[PDB]
Amino acid sequence: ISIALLPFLAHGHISPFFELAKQLAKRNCNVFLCSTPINLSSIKDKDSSASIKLVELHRNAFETAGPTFSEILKTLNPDLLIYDFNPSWAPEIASSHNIPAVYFLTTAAASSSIGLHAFKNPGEKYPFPDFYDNSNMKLLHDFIACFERSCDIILIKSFRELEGKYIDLLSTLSDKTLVPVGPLVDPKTEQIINWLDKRAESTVVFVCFGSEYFLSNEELEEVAIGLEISTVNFIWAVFVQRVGDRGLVVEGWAPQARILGHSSTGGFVSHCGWSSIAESMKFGVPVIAMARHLDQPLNGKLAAEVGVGMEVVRDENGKYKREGIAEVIRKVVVEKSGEVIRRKARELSEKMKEKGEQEIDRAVEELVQICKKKKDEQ
């Protein structure tokens, strides 16, 4: 019934853990304990009366706060622990208190399946050349650990409608049952909504590259002029700002969820972050893939494999050109050739909401199953 969460010390992992906390606190009234440093928990203090936040005070010294978290568990004594990828000692300290440990993967199943296959099956080739064409130690073991030490199941921030094939592959490779929990979700924003509401339905393209790379004056040019000749409305949260074909540039944080959820948005030029793609698919907004580093390319083609997006065609090797961007924008958002993509995005969104609440409900009942298998000898 009671669960304790130990995310990693990064706001990219605090939000998914906190949203999972809110989701598990509204079902089965799971007593919820979330272990975060006071500075990290401070940001989440807004609508969390359901969860209970617990402080943790410490080369991240995180790799030294083992006994501190041991003391926290000795006081809290949760019926189960949900750990992240890098705490390392989390699974070990939990077992020293006879607490079953379940791993929470906040990344796509395919990107992890890449490395997990290269270990479980060394020379057997990835099962799909289209996605990955296969044809020094002290880190590979630390990647599999969180999969190996996970008790029975592995929770994943993903949904079957996007990568059920890769989720099943990860299940077989890890020998664990992959349990998907689906996707998980200031006076300066009124101008944003007042602008988007006065535009027609599914005609605005939302452009954002997260905060990974502000690009450069050389790369901002290729996307700015590409948006100019696209001849479509856009909200590009970062021509000459005054000849922009009906667009709005924003400096810092933008209403990403509120823009994708607005009915006037019918396109999302994205760097293909996992949370970004999940949000784009929960609101039925097709994806314009413009990845560059990390697992973002694998994500992009992933959404391109299922048909809810399209990648820009690279003319060079470092970056793309305005034509490559304008062509795909016009094809997806405003042209008939992209109707396949738009239809799929809406149908998949309906499905993600048609099978609503069951996935986390099944996850909760399987977690309770884990807890009851541990009721051995009282």
Author numbering: 8 to 65, 91 to 167, 178 to 227, 236 to 288, 303 to 442
Q: Which of the paper's sentences describe this entry?
A:
Pq3‐O‐UGT2, an important UDP‐dependent glycosyltransferase (UGT), catalyzes the production of Ginsenoside Rg3 and Rd by extending the glycan chain of Ginsenoside Rh2 and F2, respectively, with higher selectivity for F2. Pq3‐O‐UGT2 catalyzes glucose transfer from UDP‐Glucose (UDP‐Glc) to the C2‐OH of the C3‐glucose of Ginsenoside Rh2 and F2, respectively. In this study, we elucidated the crystal structures of both apo Pq3‐O‐UGT2 and its complexes with Ginsenoside Rh2 and F2, revealing the acceptor recognition mechanisms of Pq3‐O‐UGT2. The NTD contains a seven‐stranded parallel β‐sheet sandwiched by seven helices, while the CTD comprises a 6‐stranded parallel β‐sheet flanked by 6 helices.
To elucidate the underlying molecular mechanisms, we solved crystal structures of apo Pq3‐O‐UGT2 and its complex with Rh2 at resolutions of 2.9 and 3.5 Å, respectively. The apo structure adopted a P1 space group with four molecules in the asymmetric unit, while the Pq3‐O‐UGT2‐Rh2 complex exhibited a P212121 space group with two molecules in the asymmetric unit. PISA analysis indicated the absence of higher‐order assemblies in solution, consistent with the monomeric state observed via gel filtration. The C‐terminal helix (Cα7) extends from the CTD to the NTD, stabilizing the two‐lobe structure of Pq3‐O‐UGT2. Alignment of the AlphaFold2 predicted Pq3‐O‐UGT2 structure with each of the four molecules in the asymmetric unit suggests that the absence of density in Nβ3‐Nα3, Nα5‐Nα6, and Cβ2‐Cα3 is likely due to spatial conflict during crystal packing, while the missing density of the intermediate loop may result from flexibility. Comparison of the apo and complex structures reveals significant conformational changes in the NTD.
